[PDB]
Amino acid sequence: VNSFSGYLKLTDNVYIKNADIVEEAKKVKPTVVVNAANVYLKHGGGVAGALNKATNNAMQVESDDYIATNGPLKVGGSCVLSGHNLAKHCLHVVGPNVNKGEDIQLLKSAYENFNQHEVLLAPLLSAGIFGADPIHSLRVCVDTVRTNVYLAVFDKNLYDKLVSSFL
Ligand SMILES: C[C@H]1CC[C@@](O)(CNc2ncnc3[nH]ccc23)CC1
Ligand SMILES: [Cl-]
């Protein structure tokens, strides 16, 4: 039993809710919140820009130190950093950004990072400003993640279409 509330159950291990991931994070304070990161951990917009704003830019400060030490992530890769005031940890995961021409096949590799964590709050990877079809992203999520994932979809209109079209 966990403290995630109001989710629709999609499969044995995947749950979905129309919600702002920022507001969800502050309520549950989960062990792991997933960020829709880029390889540079530049959290300017989308989910990343919103999460970073909620940390008063502390996420960006920590991220810049991480990159200065380690260099960029791989597309499809991830790193674990602090969750600041939102969660214990933030798993920064890089899905492909279609608006950069990046290979959508790497979306499965991106979701594989979730399997290293028993429970996660997460957005749909490569959705929103990353330009991929959120319906496809949901399919890859369900077919790749085996741990317990609670998916927050900000767009109420998008949430309804994802539910109604789910196979
Ligand atoms: C274009 C849509 C793509 C899918 C989204 O779910 C991604 N953005 C977010 N998702 C969840 N909490 C959030 N809080 C702030 C942003 C945000 C909603 C927008
Ligand atoms: Cl977005």
Coordinates of N, CA and C in Angstrom, one line a residue, residues 31-159:
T31 N 9.3 8.5 -3.2 CA 10.7 8.1 -3.1 C 11.5 8.6 -4.4
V32 N 10.8 8.4 -5.5 CA 11.4 8.8 -6.8 C 10.4 9.6 -7.6
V33 N 10.7 10.8 -8.1 CA 10.0 11.5 -9.1 C 10.9 11.5 -10.4
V34 N 10.4 11.2 -11.5 CA 11.1 11.1 -12.8 C 11.0 12.5 -13.4
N35 N 12.1 13.0 -13.9 CA 12.2 14.2 -14.7 C 12.4 13.8 -16.2
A36 N 11.7 14.5 -17.0 CA 11.9 14.5 -18.5 C 13.0 15.4 -18.8
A37 N 14.2 14.8 -18.7 CA 15.5 15.5 -18.8 C 16.0 15.5 -20.3
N38 N 16.9 16.5 -20.5 CA 17.8 16.4 -21.7 C 19.2 16.0 -21.3
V39 N 20.0 15.7 -22.3 CA 21.4 15.2 -22.0 C 22.2 16.2 -21.2
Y40 N 21.9 17.5 -21.3 CA 22.7 18.5 -20.6 C 22.1 18.9 -19.3
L41 N 21.0 18.2 -18.9 CA 20.2 18.6 -17.7 C 20.0 20.1 -17.6
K42 N 19.6 20.7 -18.7 CA 19.2 22.1 -18.8 C 17.6 22.1 -18.7
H43 N 17.1 22.5 -17.5 CA 15.7 22.3 -17.2 C 14.9 23.5 -17.5
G44 N 14.8 23.8 -18.8 CA 14.3 25.1 -19.2 C 12.8 25.2 -19.4
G45 N 12.2 24.1 -19.8 CA 10.8 24.1 -20.1 C 10.2 22.7 -20.0
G46 N 8.9 22.5 -20.4 CA 8.3 21.3 -20.2 C 8.2 20.9 -18.7
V47 N 8.1 19.5 -18.5 CA 8.1 19.0 -17.2 C 9.4 19.4 -16.4
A48 N 10.5 19.4 -17.1 CA 11.8 19.7 -16.4 C 11.8 21.2 -15.9
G49 N 11.4 22.1 -16.8 CA 11.3 23.5 -16.4 C 10.4 23.7 -15.2
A50 N 9.3 23.0 -15.2 CA 8.3 23.1 -14.1 C 8.8 22.5 -12.8
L51 N 9.4 21.3 -12.8 CA 10.0 20.7 -11.6 C 11.1 21.6 -11.1
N52 N 12.0 22.1 -11.9 CA 13.1 22.9 -11.4 C 12.6 24.2 -10.8
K53 N 11.6 24.8 -11.4 CA 11.0 26.0 -10.8 C 10.5 25.7 -9.4
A54 N 9.8 24.6 -9.2 CA 9.3 24.2 -7.9 C 10.4 24.0 -6.8
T55 N 11.6 23.7 -7.2 CA 12.8 23.6 -6.3 C 13.5 24.9 -6.2
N56 N 13.0 26.0 -6.7 CA 13.6 27.3 -6.5 C 15.0 27.3 -7.2
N57 N 15.1 26.6 -8.3 CA 16.4 26.4 -9.1 C 17.4 25.6 -8.5
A58 N 17.2 25.0 -7.3 CA 18.2 24.1 -6.7 C 18.5 22.9 -7.6
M59 N 17.4 22.4 -8.3 CA 17.7 21.2 -9.2 C 18.7 21.6 -10.3
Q60 N 18.5 22.8 -10.8 CA 19.5 23.3 -11.9 C 20.9 23.4 -11.3
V61 N 21.0 24.0 -10.1 CA 22.4 24.2 -9.5 C 23.0 22.8 -9.3
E62 N 22.3 21.8 -8.8 CA 22.8 20.5 -8.6 C 23.2 19.9 -9.9
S63 N 22.3 20.0 -10.9 CA 22.5 19.5 -12.2 C 23.8 20.0 -12.9
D64 N 24.0 21.3 -12.8 CA 25.2 21.9 -13.5 C 26.5 21.3 -12.9
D65 N 26.5 21.1 -11.6 CA 27.6 20.5 -10.9 C 27.8 19.0 -11.4
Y66 N 26.7 18.3 -11.6 CA 26.7 16.9 -12.1 C 27.3 16.9 -13.5
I67 N 26.9 17.8 -14.4 CA 27.4 17.8 -15.8 C 28.9 18.3 -15.8
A68 N 29.2 19.3 -15.0 CA 30.6 19.7 -14.9 C 31.6 18.5 -14.5
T69 N 31.1 17.6 -13.7 CA 31.9 16.5 -13.3 C 31.9 15.3 -14.2
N70 N 30.7 15.0 -14.8 CA 30.5 13.8 -15.5 C 30.2 13.9 -17.0
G71 N 30.0 15.1 -17.5 CA 29.6 15.3 -18.9 C 28.2 14.9 -19.1
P72 N 27.7 15.1 -20.4 CA 26.3 14.8 -20.7 C 25.9 13.4 -20.5
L73 N 24.6 13.2 -20.3 CA 24.0 11.9 -20.3 C 23.9 11.4 -21.8
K74 N 23.5 10.1 -22.0 CA 23.2 9.6 -23.2 C 21.7 9.7 -23.4
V75 N 21.2 9.9 -24.7 CA 19.8 9.7 -25.0 C 19.5 8.3 -24.7
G76 N 18.4 8.1 -23.9 CA 18.0 6.8 -23.4 C 18.6 6.5 -22.0
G77 N 19.5 7.4 -21.5 CA 20.1 7.2 -20.2 C 19.4 8.0 -19.1
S78 N 20.1 7.9 -17.9 CA 19.5 8.5 -16.7 C 20.6 8.8 -15.7
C79 N 20.3 9.6 -14.7 CA 21.1 9.7 -13.5 C 20.1 9.9 -12.3
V80 N 20.5 9.5 -11.1 CA 19.8 9.8 -9.9 C 20.4 11.0 -9.2
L81 N 19.6 12.0 -8.9 CA 20.0 13.1 -8.2 C 19.0 13.4 -7.1
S82 N 19.2 14.5 -6.3 CA 18.3 14.8 -5.2 C 16.9 15.1 -5.7
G83 N 15.9 14.7 -4.9 CA 14.6 15.2 -5.2 C 14.2 16.5 -4.6
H84 N 15.1 17.1 -3.8 CA 14.9 18.4 -3.2 C 13.7 18.4 -2.4
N85 N 12.8 19.4 -2.5 CA 11.6 19.5 -1.7 C 10.4 18.7 -2.3
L86 N 10.7 17.9 -3.4 CA 9.6 17.3 -4.1 C 9.5 15.8 -3.9
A87 N 10.7 15.1 -3.6 CA 10.8 13.7 -3.5 C 12.1 13.4 -2.8
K88 N 12.3 12.1 -2.4 CA 13.6 11.8 -1.9 C 14.7 11.9 -3.0
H89 N 14.4 11.3 -4.2 CA 15.3 11.3 -5.3 C 14.6 11.8 -6.6
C90 N 15.3 12.4 -7.5 CA 14.9 12.6 -8.8 C 15.7 11.7 -9.8
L91 N 14.9 10.9 -10.6 CA 15.5 10.1 -11.7 C 15.4 11.0 -12.9
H92 N 16.5 11.5 -13.4 CA 16.5 12.3 -14.6 C 16.7 11.3 -15.8
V93 N 15.6 11.2 -16.6 CA 15.6 10.3 -17.7 C 15.5 11.0 -19.0
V94 N 16.4 10.7 -20.0 CA 16.4 11.3 -21.3 C 15.7 10.4 -22.3
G95 N 14.5 10.8 -22.7 CA 13.8 10.2 -23.8 C 14.3 10.9 -25.1
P96 N 14.1 10.3 -26.2 CA 14.4 11.0 -27.5 C 13.5 12.2 -27.7
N97 N 14.1 13.3 -28.2 CA 13.3 14.5 -28.6 C 13.1 14.5 -30.1
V98 N 11.9 14.1 -30.5 CA 11.6 14.0 -31.9 C 11.9 15.4 -32.6
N99 N 11.7 16.5 -32.0 CA 12.0 17.8 -32.5 C 13.5 18.1 -32.7
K100 N 14.3 17.2 -32.2 CA 15.7 17.2 -32.5 C 16.1 16.1 -33.5
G101 N 15.2 15.3 -34.0 CA 15.5 14.2 -34.9 C 16.0 12.9 -34.2
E102 N 15.8 12.8 -32.9 CA 16.4 11.6 -32.2 C 15.5 10.4 -32.4
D103 N 16.2 9.2 -32.4 CA 15.6 8.0 -32.8 C 14.5 7.6 -31.7
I104 N 13.3 7.4 -32.1 CA 12.2 7.0 -31.2 C 12.4 5.6 -30.6
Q105 N 13.2 4.8 -31.3 CA 13.5 3.5 -30.7 C 14.2 3.5 -29.3
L106 N 14.9 4.6 -29.1 CA 15.6 4.9 -27.8 C 14.5 5.1 -26.7
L107 N 13.3 5.2 -27.0 CA 12.3 5.4 -26.0 C 12.2 4.2 -25.1
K108 N 12.3 3.0 -25.6 CA 12.3 1.8 -24.8 C 13.5 1.8 -23.8
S109 N 14.7 2.1 -24.3 CA 15.8 2.2 -23.5 C 15.6 3.2 -22.3
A110 N 15.0 4.3 -22.6 CA 14.7 5.3 -21.6 C 13.8 4.8 -20.5
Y111 N 12.7 4.1 -20.9 CA 11.8 3.5 -19.9 C 12.5 2.4 -19.1
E112 N 13.5 1.7 -19.7 CA 14.2 0.6 -18.9 C 14.8 1.2 -17.6
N113 N 15.2 2.4 -17.6 CA 15.7 3.0 -16.4 C 14.8 2.9 -15.2
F114 N 13.5 3.0 -15.5 CA 12.5 2.9 -14.4 C 12.5 1.6 -13.7
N115 N 13.0 0.5 -14.3 CA 13.0 -0.8 -13.7 C 14.0 -0.9 -12.5
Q116 N 14.9 0.1 -12.3 CA 15.8 0.1 -11.2 C 15.2 0.6 -10.0
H117 N 13.9 1.0 -10.0 CA 13.3 1.6 -8.8 C 11.9 1.0 -8.6
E118 N 11.6 0.6 -7.4 CA 10.4 -0.2 -7.1 C 9.1 0.5 -7.4
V119 N 9.1 1.9 -7.1 CA 7.9 2.7 -7.3 C 8.4 4.1 -7.8
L120 N 7.7 4.6 -8.8 CA 8.0 5.9 -9.3 C 6.8 6.7 -9.7
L121 N 6.9 8.1 -9.5 CA 6.0 9.0 -10.1 C 6.7 9.5 -11.3
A122 N 5.9 9.6 -12.5 CA 6.6 9.9 -13.7 C 5.7 10.5 -14.8
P123 N 6.3 11.3 -15.7 CA 5.5 11.7 -16.9 C 5.7 10.7 -18.0
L124 N 4.9 10.8 -19.0 CA 5.2 10.1 -20.3 C 6.4 10.6 -21.0
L125 N 7.4 9.7 -21.1 CA 8.7 10.1 -21.7 C 8.4 10.5 -23.2
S126 N 9.2 11.5 -23.6 CA 9.2 12.0 -24.9 C 7.8 12.6 -25.3
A127 N 6.9 12.8 -24.4 CA 5.6 13.5 -24.7 C 5.8 15.0 -24.6
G128 N 4.7 15.7 -24.8 CA 4.8 17.2 -24.6 C 5.8 17.8 -25.7
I129 N 6.7 18.6 -25.2 CA 7.6 19.3 -26.1 C 8.7 18.4 -26.7
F130 N 8.8 17.2 -26.2 CA 9.7 16.3 -26.8 C 9.2 15.7 -28.1
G131 N 7.9 15.9 -28.4 CA 7.4 15.7 -29.8 C 6.9 14.3 -30.2
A132 N 7.0 13.4 -29.3 CA 6.5 12.0 -29.6 C 5.0 11.9 -29.3
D133 N 4.4 10.9 -29.9 CA 3.0 10.6 -29.7 C 2.8 10.1 -28.3
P134 N 2.1 10.8 -27.4 CA 1.9 10.3 -26.1 C 1.2 8.9 -26.0
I135 N 0.4 8.6 -27.0 CA -0.2 7.2 -27.0 C 0.8 6.2 -27.1
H136 N 1.8 6.4 -28.1 CA 2.9 5.4 -28.3 C 3.7 5.4 -27.0
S137 N 4.1 6.5 -26.5 CA 4.9 6.5 -25.2 C 4.2 5.7 -24.2
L138 N 2.9 5.8 -24.0 CA 2.2 5.0 -23.0 C 2.3 3.5 -23.3
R139 N 2.2 3.1 -24.6 CA 2.3 1.7 -25.0 C 3.7 1.2 -24.6
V140 N 4.8 2.0 -25.0 CA 6.1 1.5 -24.6 C 6.3 1.4 -23.1
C141 N 5.7 2.4 -22.4 CA 5.8 2.3 -20.9 C 5.2 1.0 -20.4
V142 N 4.0 0.7 -20.8 CA 3.4 -0.5 -20.3 C 4.1 -1.8 -20.7
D143 N 4.7 -1.8 -21.9 CA 5.4 -3.0 -22.4 C 6.9 -3.1 -21.9
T144 N 7.4 -2.1 -21.2 CA 8.8 -2.0 -20.8 C 9.0 -2.0 -19.3
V145 N 8.2 -1.2 -18.6 CA 8.3 -1.0 -17.2 C 7.6 -2.1 -16.4
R146 N 8.4 -2.8 -15.5 CA 7.8 -3.8 -14.7 C 7.6 -3.4 -13.2
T147 N 8.3 -2.3 -12.8 CA 8.1 -1.8 -11.5 C 6.8 -0.9 -11.5
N148 N 6.4 -0.4 -10.3 CA 5.2 0.3 -10.1 C 5.3 1.7 -10.5
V149 N 4.6 2.1 -11.6 CA 4.8 3.5 -12.1 C 3.4 4.2 -12.0
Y150 N 3.4 5.4 -11.5 CA 2.3 6.3 -11.4 C 2.5 7.4 -12.3
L151 N 1.7 7.4 -13.4 CA 1.9 8.4 -14.5 C 1.0 9.6 -14.4
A152 N 1.6 10.8 -14.4 CA 0.8 12.0 -14.3 C 0.8 12.7 -15.7
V153 N -0.4 12.9 -16.2 CA -0.7 13.5 -17.5 C -1.3 14.9 -17.2
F154 N -0.6 15.9 -17.6 CA -1.1 17.3 -17.2 C -2.3 17.7 -18.0
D155 N -2.3 17.4 -19.3 CA -3.4 17.8 -20.2 C -4.6 16.9 -19.9
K156 N -5.7 17.5 -19.4 CA -6.9 16.7 -19.1 C -7.5 16.1 -20.4
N157 N -7.4 16.9 -21.5 CA -7.8 16.4 -22.8 C -7.0 15.2 -23.2
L158 N -5.6 15.3 -23.0 CA -4.8 14.2 -23.4 C -5.0 13.0 -22.5
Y159 N -5.2 13.2 -21.2 CA -5.5 12.1 -20.3 C -6.7 11.3 -20.8

